[PDB]
Amino acid sequence: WVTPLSRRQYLLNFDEHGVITNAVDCSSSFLSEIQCKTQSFAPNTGVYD
Amino acid sequence: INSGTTCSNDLLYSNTEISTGVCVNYDLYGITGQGIFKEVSAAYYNNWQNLLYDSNGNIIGFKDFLTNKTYTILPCYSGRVSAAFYQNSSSPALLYRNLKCSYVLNNISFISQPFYFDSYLGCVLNAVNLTSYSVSSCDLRMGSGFCIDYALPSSPYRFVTFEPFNVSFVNDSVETVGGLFEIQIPTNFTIAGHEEFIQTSSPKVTIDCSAFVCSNYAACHDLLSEYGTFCDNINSILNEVNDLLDITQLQVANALMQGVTLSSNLNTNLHSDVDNIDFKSLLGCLGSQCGSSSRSPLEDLLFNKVKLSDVGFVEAYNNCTGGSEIRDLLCVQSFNGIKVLPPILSETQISGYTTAATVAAMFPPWSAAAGVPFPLNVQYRINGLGVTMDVLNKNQKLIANAFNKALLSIQNGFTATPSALAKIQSVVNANAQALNSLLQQLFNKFGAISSSLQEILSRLDPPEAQVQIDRLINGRLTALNAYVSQQLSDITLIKAGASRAIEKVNECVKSQSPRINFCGNGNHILSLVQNAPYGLLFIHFSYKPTSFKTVLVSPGLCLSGDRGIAPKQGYFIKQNDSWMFTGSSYYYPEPISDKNVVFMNSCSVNFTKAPFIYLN
Amino acid sequence: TNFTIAGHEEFIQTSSPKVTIDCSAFVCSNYAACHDLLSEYGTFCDNINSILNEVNDLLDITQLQVANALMQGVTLSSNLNTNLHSDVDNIDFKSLLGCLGSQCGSSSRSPLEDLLFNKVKLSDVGFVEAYNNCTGGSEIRDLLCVQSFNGIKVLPPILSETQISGYTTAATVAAMFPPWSAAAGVPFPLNVQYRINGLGVTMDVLNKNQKLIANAFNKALLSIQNGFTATPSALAKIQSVVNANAQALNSLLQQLFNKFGAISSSLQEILSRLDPPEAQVQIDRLINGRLTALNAYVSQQLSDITLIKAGASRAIEKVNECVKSQSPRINFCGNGNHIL
Amino acid sequence: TALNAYVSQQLSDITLIKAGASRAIEKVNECVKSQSPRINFCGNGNHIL
Ligand SMILES: *[C@@H]1O[C@H](CO)[C@@H](O)[C@H](O)[C@H]1NC(C)=O
Ligand SMILES: *[C@@H]1O[C@H](CO)[C@@H](O)[C@H](O)[C@H]1NC(C)=O
Ligand SMILES: *[C@@H]1O[C@H](CO)[C@@H](O)[C@H](O)[C@H]1NC(C)=O
Ligand SMILES: *[C@@H]1O[C@H](CO)[C@@H](O)[C@H](O)[C@H]1NC(C)=O
Ligand SMILES: *[C@@H]1O[C@H](CO)[C@@H](O)[C@H](O)[C@H]1NC(C)=O
Ligand SMILES: *[C@@H]1O[C@H](CO)[C@@H](O)[C@H](O)[C@H]1NC(C)=O
Ligand SMILES: *[C@@H]1O[C@H](CO)[C@@H](O)[C@H](O)[C@H]1NC(C)=O
């Protein structure tokens, strides 16, 4: 399998051992936009603009 | 530039017709932009005129040379999207305010959404139209009385209405049924409690204007010395905010300690109950032997759930040098100039003042009750609401048990889900967020090559270093100005709240005011005061009926001889063919006398005539 | 020797339009070379939104407190239709009641409220209608849609005007029909007689003269109703607040046409005439000025919200002490001889 | 920048000035021209005139 690359923003999550476990692309969906705005993976309930 | 006839045909293109109704990029003889065209009929274009401008210098029209037609230029839509997301959900709901679903699905969206419908606010995506159902509280408020609710298993989101308040309904009449009205009078009652928190202070924040900017570098200090003082304006604002906080605390202490006198024979270890009412959970220590802590058990339970208190900051700052782990953010903030100072008065002194104010309304000479004993004052304040004195004199142990149960309930309610602690933790989190933002402000480039002065001083020349440090200095000074403006805006509201706090302390606790619907909710009886983190806690006792009955009452009667009688805080009932009097808050028939009836000298029109009342 | 009854009016501001501003949409409309520089001022964007959200939350809490004060301890019967019962003791209340019961619909305001709202266009419903008549037909050359195209937009409040009108109607009915939950259980004529007697008037004249009092109340209500044809003080303030809001919005919008010492106030000409190494400075020159303007605007808003909240608290106190009860505070509700 | 800071400080202080003036108006209307049935408002407990 081959896929192209580009310069884009990504969110990284490091555990207590320094291993990447989760990641989300901020330019994929609106939930990913909310996650990158809150810099987390389980944002609180609210109305995000 | 970009206007005229002399053009460069290096990048040549073919001429295209002018399209109307779509937002496209146009190159009209050098005029470049983006907008929508519209064919109109304009006759103001002369021979030497081909463009239409406004007062701001924007093209809003033109006339083509090849085809003498007129058009208007208007930009297309540009807005944002409002999304409501729950705690754990797959995808959040969408709402395009003031836009139809057709326009969204045809112009700004290219995803085939299965759920879509129009509303009063706009097109709603990923939701169900259930406006026929109403709720009392919802965390996703959209406006105009609509809010989105989440239901765990179509789509889990629902579009319902919002109605947080409603009135109580009865099955009585709204007319005069046979000359008498139909109203309900309570037959049984109890005592209920209610807590309330009012913020009276805020953490005193002090910022070192010479440490936040130019921490330890000498060239940075020499460059900052060229901007004048630029730090005295911040220091004066911080000092005046601290002075306002100190004046507020002193005024609160004076209001708590205004005109109070006790006896020199109390010990708080043997005299802690009156009329079988337990008050041990609302008293500290007053006597000879007592430790460094004088907080009541309620204050202890309140302070044990908050970490950032008057002593918490002191302990956190003590645990910065040496120790085991210095990973706390408070030490990092203190190492940059941001530090919190303790208030002028300790919490133990406020707790002692509150204990003295509470005792002043519990033992002779009853300073906080104008010289009236506690049970007598309670009976008077209950009678003032329309309750006969007989049922109060007969039911005293019941009132004591109700007070004890209310105290136990208000003490146990703070364990699982309190209400006063929410405001305290919200204030703490707001202060922490402000401090974290002010700290993270130092990690911005502000147009420079880096946000660290060490790299700039170890990589570039002194002139380049100055050029790169100037922008950082300006940005940090702007941030400090914004922060002190925010601090002023917050201290104004803190003063506004402390004013009402002092007013309620003076008019609801240490005295009984005739102001109805001010301390409680119309049936207020007694209010107490307790010490709380960054404020005070009030315990409001009220009169709460439990049972009711339907009776027929009369507004007023007229006796023989064109005389009239009018009741005060009561009504006239009829039993066994006899007119009597009853209270407005308790059903207890009693003979008609002169101490509860207003005498008149005129017979009204709609008053019931009864020449059988033998009253002088 | 002889007396009459006079009426007065007073307007107290309790809320304000909720203005939301986006840093990106205001600074860099649709340009990437501008976003690349705005990304450096990261912390300057997520502070204006936070301040505006705090202001909106404070306004919502204020509106909820006003609603709670208007709907605190109101017991009404279930046999009131608001159309069969509209007058008591020869005193009309048609111009002061809306619609209450299981027979109403969307329209629930009163004729007086309708007459007052028919002269004010820049209301929440007005903003909604304007944003609907924006782009997509009904040519949007107005300034509101132009402000909306740059990030400046006004959001509607949490509670609509219909719910507030219903709350006021319920509060008015609470002191008009039994049980009198807003008059301590005293009927309206007896309450008026007691309030007049409390000033030093004997009960004989009050008991003998009741139709005169009813006619005086009706005449006062009619004079208050047919008095908005001219320009009163209440309507003057209701227009002045929205005029000041519009002036502030236009002054904020006009800031986009300033050069701040650059070659031009438009990023298109800078990006189409100069190279990026020479255009970055020109873009930052405008970014700084626009950020300063937004900071000044949010500072002014945070300064005004305090006075707004103070006025709202004063209105809540007047509602709790002068409307739903009779407080023995002289020179507080009226000019000494206040009745109700 | 200095002028903006000064006018911001003035606009901030105006609110406290207006609050104090409103309190003064209330105290004048409820303690000088009339005897209010309130305690610990005009004076200190035993207030006469
Ligand atoms: C939106 O789409 C419709 C249909 O595709 C089209 O007729 C209309 O011109 C579009 N609007 C704009 C502003 O491009
Ligand atoms: C447009 O007007 C000019 C001025 O009279 C004229 O010379 C030209 O022929 C006109 N163009 C067309 C297409 O009629
Ligand atoms: C949503 O439901 C309400 C109540 O049934 C109805 O009046 C309204 O027309 C519905 N909306 C749409 C877009 O069908
Ligand atoms: C009134 O309520 C109390 C509380 O439960 C109860 O103990 C008492 O028996 C009741 N009295 C009557 C007459 O129902
Ligand atoms: C008076 O009240 C106290 C406190 O409730 C009680 O202990 C005492 O027994 C009462 N006196 C009499 C004679 O009942
Ligand atoms: C008081 O004035 C009214 C209005 O003119 C009049 O109807 C009434 O008779 C007057 N009362 C007396 C006692 O003159
Ligand atoms: C007295 O009753 C009549 C009907 O019999 C009614 O029209 C009038 O309004 C009533 N007046 C008062 C003061 O209740």
Curated annotation (Swiss-Prot), chain B:
Isolate N5 belongs to genotype C. Genotype C probably arose from recombination between genotypes A and B. GO terms for molecular function: identical protein binding. Homotrimer; each monomer consists of a S1 and a S2 subunit. The resulting peplomers protrude from the virus surface as spikes. The keyword Transmembrane applies. Disulfide bonds join C320-C331. Fusion peptide 1 (FP1) and fusion peptide 2 (FP2) function cooperatively and have a membrane-ordering effect on lipid headgroups and shallow hydrophobic regions of target bilayers. They are considered as two domains of an extended, bipartite FP. The membrane-ordering activity is calcium-dependent and also dependent on correct folding, which is maintained by an internal disulfide bond in FP2. It comes from the Viruses. It is found in: Virion membrane; Host endoplasmic reticulum-Golgi intermediate compartment membrane; Host cell membrane. Glycans are attached at N68, N88, N107, N129, N166, N171, N188, N319, N576, N606, N616. Residues 296-317 are annotated as: Fusion peptide 1. Residues 425-469 form a coiled coil. Keywords: Coiled coil, Disulfide bond, Fusion of virus membrane with host endosomal membrane, Fusion of virus membrane with host membrane, Glycoprotein, Host cell membrane, Host membrane, Host-virus interaction, Lipoprotein, Membrane, Palmitate, Signal, Transmembrane, Transmembrane helix, Viral attachment to host cell, Viral envelope protein, Viral penetration into host cytoplasm, Virion, Virulence, Virus entry into host cell. This is Spike glycoprotein. The chain holds residues 597 to 1221 of 1351 of the full protein. Belongs to the betacoronaviruses spike protein family. GO terms for biological process: endocytosis involved in viral entry into host cell; fusion of virus membrane with host endosome membrane; fusion of virus membrane with host plasma membrane; receptor-mediated virion attachment to host cell. The gene is S. One of its GO terms (cellular component) is virion membrane. Its main location: virion. It comes from Human coronavirus HKU1 (isolate N5) (HCoV-HKU1). Specific enzymatic cleavages in vivo yield mature proteins. The precursor is processed into S1 and S2 by host cell furin or another cellular protease to yield the mature S1 and S2 proteins. Additionally, a second cleavage leads to the release of a fusion peptide after viral attachment to host cell receptor. The cytoplasmic Cys-rich domain is palmitoylated. Spike glycoprotein is digested within host endosomes. The record marks R295, S296 as: Cleavage. Residues 315-335 are annotated as: Fusion peptide 2. Residues 396-446 are annotated as: Heptad repeat 1.
